[PDB]
Structure formats: structure tokens, C-alpha cells
């Protein structure tokens, strides 16, 4: 019944079309009209079957991929999309991305969303500060979900989007990839500001920057000290650890059998560990 029943041709995309059967929709609704009024479909109570007919017509119209004009309003049609189709998309507006990420909010990242993110970043040429803000907002563990190789392609300018808690899942490899980028982003700052910004990254910092910070009265939180690289705290002197921890040197004895602290103590002489007056023990015996 290719022909559309008389008086049933759709001049407009409205709710009156919900009582059209699938074939009635295929025969009575022109694809260009749908493309122009996509913005109305998400407010109409169309069944999954009728929405399938609609997506079929949208495909008929755009065989080279949808335009962002239609992709912004896809709504729950973005779920009936295939990754192959999304790989042909040119999505540029952050608001389009925010609208598509809101359709499957809460649930785990679907393959469609991964492909959308990849196409978006490959179009923008990088992972921007704004784009990273968006992605972390929708998916909090996004940053630490990237390999140390992928994480290496992040420009330093976008580090201003990385909040401290966004690194509470990153492994030492990722932290080591990130610390230079944050060092560059926060470079050109002065004193307490640099530290306030780089404290959450120092878990991937080397020994040289640690000594440089010690020589500038930083008063490093001991909880931050516990997050440092064991291999990077060993080559430090008692005077350096003292200048770094500032007044927080008191908590050393409380953390005397823990990751970095015990390994550092065991590599120091008791004659110098006793210079702190805190009662530390485990130093290389004199002689």
C-alpha cells in the first residue's frame, strides 16, 4: 500500500501522527519535513517502532551522515544509532555534545558515546579545557580512564580543568604523564600559588622539583607527602624533608611504617634522623 491514504499526508510533525501505523508513517511523512522539524520529536509520545520508521527516513535523506542540525535534536534516537553512522558525523558545538550525553546519563558509557567523543575530539584537534570539563562532568573518571599513551596527547592548557579528585583514580604512570603538563600549565606562577595548583599532581614529580620546593618554604601537607613517589623521596636529606614538611614534620612518627616514609627512614643514618627531635627510629646505625 505504497500510496498514502487520502487526507492523511502529513503537512507537519505534530502529535496527530502517533495514531499512524508504521506503514502510514513511512508513506505519509516526507523525510525533509522530518529533518527540518526534528526538534519536536522528543516531546511527542512516539513508540519505539514509529521512531524506528523515523530514523529509517532520516537515513534515507542523509546517506553521508547526519548534519549537526539533525544530530542536536536526535534525542532518544541517538540510541538507535550505530557507531559506523556516528563515525561519519561532524559535531562541533559543545551544546550538541551536552545534549547527546544527557540521553544516556547515569548509565555506563555506550559504544555510541565513545565514538561520539572520539569524533568530537578529532574534529576539535585536541582535548580542550571546556571539552574536558564537559566530559568529566558527565563521566567523572574520564581522565583516569585514558591510557598513559592517550593521556600524553592532552594539551597542558586543559590541565586547568583537572580538579584534585579527578586524579584520585590515576595510577603512577598516568600521574607521571600528567605532572609535566601541570608543571607547564602552572609555570609562570609565583610561590604559594604554584603549590596550591600542583599539590594534587606531585604524585608524579621527580626529586629535583621536590628539592626546589623544599628550598622555598612550602609547608607540605603530610598527607600529600604520603602520596609522593617512593623512588623520588629516597634521595632527599633530612634537612630537605624538614624544610618541605615545615611544621607538619610532627606527623612523621605517626606515619613511620608507611609507603614512602619507612623506605626513606631505612636509607638514612640515625645520627641525622635524631636531628629532628621527633624520636624517629630505623636509621643506619652509626659506625
Amino acid at each position: 500500500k505504497t500510496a498514502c491514504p487520502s487526507g492523511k499526508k502529513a503537512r507537519e510533525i505534530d502529535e496527530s501522527l502517533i495514531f499512524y501505523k508504521k506503514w502510514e508513517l513511512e508513506a505519509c511523512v516526507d523525510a525533509a519535513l522530518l529533518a527540518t522539524q526534528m526538534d519536536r520529536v522528543n516531546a511527542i509520545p512516539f513508540t519505539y517502532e514509529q521512531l524506528d520508521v523515523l530514523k529509517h527516513k532520516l537515513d534515507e535523506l542523509y546517506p553521508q551522515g547526519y548534519p549537526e542540525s539533525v544530530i542536536q535534536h536526535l534525542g532518544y534516537l541517538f540510541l538507535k544509532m550505530s557507531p559506523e553512522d556516528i563515525r561519519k558525523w561532524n559535531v562541533t558545538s559543545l551544546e550538541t555534545l551536552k545534549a547527546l550525553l544527557e540521553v544516556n546519563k547515569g548509565h555506563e558509557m555506550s559504544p555510541q558515546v565513545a565514538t561520539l567523543i572520539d569524533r568530537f575530539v578529532k574534529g576539535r584537534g585536541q582535548l580542550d579545557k571546556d571539552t574536558l570539563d564537559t566530559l568529566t562532568a558527565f563521566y567523572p573518571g574520564y581522565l583516569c580512564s585514558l591510557s598513559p599513551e592517550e593521556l600524553s596527547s592532552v594539551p597542558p592548557s586543559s590541565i586547568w580543568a583537572v580538579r584534585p579528585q579527578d586524579l584520585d583514580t590515576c595510577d603512577p604512570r598516568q600521574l607521571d604523564v600528567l605532572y609535566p603538563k601541570a608543571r607547564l600549565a602552572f609555570q609562570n606562577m609565583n610561590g604559594s600559588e604554584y603549590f596550591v595548583k600542583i599539590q594534587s599532581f606531585l604524585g608524579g614529580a621527580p626529586t629535583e622539583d621536590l628539592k626546589a620546593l623544599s628550598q622555598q618554604n612550602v609547608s607540605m601537607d603530610l598527607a600529600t607527602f604520603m602520596k609522593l613517589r617512593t623512588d623520588a623521596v629516597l634521595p632527599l636529606t633530612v634537612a630537605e624533608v624538614q624544610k618541605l614538611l615545615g611544621p607538619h614534620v610532627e606527623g612523621l612518627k605517626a606515619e613511620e611504617r608507611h609507603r614512602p616514609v619507612r623506605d626513606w627512614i631505612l636509607r638514612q643514618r640515625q645520627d641525622d634522623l635524631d636531628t629532628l627531635g621527633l624520636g624517629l627510629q630505623g636509621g643506619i646505625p652509626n659506625g
Epitope: 496527530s16 495514531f19 508504521k22 522528543n42 509520545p45 517502532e49
Partner: antibody
């Protein structure tokens, strides 16, 4: 099996409002439409509206706009109809019913919620 | 709104008789549905898409029609078919039901 468990009888005073429920069981109601029907004792049937839960979209019989508001909790696979500014004429039995696959009518009906509006 | 008028409003048929009730619409409707309702019960889907019988409906029931006129026919009325039958148009928004045809059994 497919089952539409409706809320219980209701009594409310004029000018008030009530909210009646329809728990769907035996199928994924996210794809189907949920329609609501009114039947006054000794009278025929009257379609109120329908709702799709995936986007919570709703289409109403213009007679019942401003009188019935359809909502859905997908967590519990439940649909709700809120009846507003109750009068005596709103006293009746309200059914929920599932829409067919391709517009094949209402294939599974609820049991009927009685609503009485009186002082 | 499409106004569906059912006729007869009340029908009295002896068991064994063939009976036919009609639903007349104010405008052409693509499809029609027929529900059976027995007192103190929720309506049950009897015929959908004009002529298809729903699961469990006896074969003596049939539905047909087009345009402005649709009909439901019982070949051999049996005492278990006393009830009110409602037609519903699935063409134009909003959905609309018929006033019903009530079927009583002669005895």
C-alpha cells in the same frame, strides 16, 4: 504474565486532587504507550491520554487537559495519573491500559480505580 | 473529534442466531477496534485492526468494515456472549469510543 496492578479506591473532597497508580509487570514498559480511560457508572468509555516512559512524553484528549497529568517512574515500572481540581463529574472508574505494538488497540487493561469526589 | 454511533443500543438474541452490530463514524477511519465488557469488569480486547481476532476470542466472532461503517458479527450467539461491545477508532487524534451495543440473551 502481563499485569497492570492499579491503586485502590479513592475518596477526595471537591477542589482537591488525587494521584492513582498503575504498576506494570511482565514486560519492558519503556517502549509501549500507557493510556488512561474514564468510565462513569452507567456511561461509556472516554480516553484521557497516553504517555511514553522512555522520554515521559504525553498526549492528552483536549477535554482532559488541565485535569489529568501523566507521569512515570521507570525505576518501579509505574505510571501515575494526577487528577486535579476535583469536581463531582470526576467521580468514576479510571483504567490504565497498554497500547498495542503497531497501534493494535489496548491489549492489556488494568482492573479499574474507583474515585469518588464528595464532601 | 470523530463521533462513533453504535447500533443497536440494545440487542436481544436467542442462542443460535446470527447477529450483527454496527459502528458509524462521522469521518473515514483507517482502522477500528472492538472491546467486550461484562458488568463489573475491565474491557477486554476482542477484535483489533478491523478484523483480526484477539488471543482467546471464539471463531464465531468476526469484524469488518471500512470508511464510515464498521461491523461486528456473531455467527452463532451463545449464552456466554451477553455483554456490552465498544468500538474505538484509531485514525484521528483524539481516540474516541462508541456508546456501546449491549447484548442480552433471549430465553
Amino acid at each position: 504474565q502481563v499485569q497492570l496492578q492499579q491503586s485502590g479506591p479513592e475518596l477526595e473532597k471537591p477542589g482537591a486532587s488525587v494521584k492513582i497508580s498503575c504498576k506494570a509487570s511482565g514486560y519492558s514498559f519503556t517502549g509501549y504507550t500507557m493510556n488512561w480511560v474514564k468510565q462513569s457508572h452507567g456511561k461509556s468509555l472516554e480516553w484521557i491520554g497516553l504517555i511514553t516512559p522512555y522520554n515521559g512524553a504525553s498526549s492528552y484528549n483536549q477535554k482532559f487537559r488541565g485535569k489529568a497529568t501523566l507521569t512515570v517512574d521507570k525505576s518501579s515500572s509505574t505510571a501515575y495519573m494526577d487528577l486535579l481540581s476535583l469536581t463531582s463529574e470526576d467521580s468514576a472508574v479510571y483504567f490504565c491500559a497498554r497500547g498495542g505494538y503497531d497501534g493494535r488497540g489496548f491489549d492489556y487493561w488494568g482492573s479499574g480505580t474507583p474515585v469518588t469526589v464528595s464532601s | 473529534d470523530i463521533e462513533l454511533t453504535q447500533s443497536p443500543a440494545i440487542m436481544s438474541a436467542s442462542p443460535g442466531e446470527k447477529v450483527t452490530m454496527t459502528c458509524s463514524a462521522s469521518s473515514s477511519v483507517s482502522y477500528m477496534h472492538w472491546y467486550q465488557q461484562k458488568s463489573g469488569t475491565s474491557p477486554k480486547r476482542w477484535i483489533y485492526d478491523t478484523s483480526k481476532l484477539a488471543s482467546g476470542v471464539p471463531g464465531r466472532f468476526s469484524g469488518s468494515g471500512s470508511g464510515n461503517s464498521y461491523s461486528l458479527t456473531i455467527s452463532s450467539v451463545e449464552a456466554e456472549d451477553d455483554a456490552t461491545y465498544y468500538c474505538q477508532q484509531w485514525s484521528k487524534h483524539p481516540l474516541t469510543f462508541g456508546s456501546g451495543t449491549k447484548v442480552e440473551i433471549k430465553r
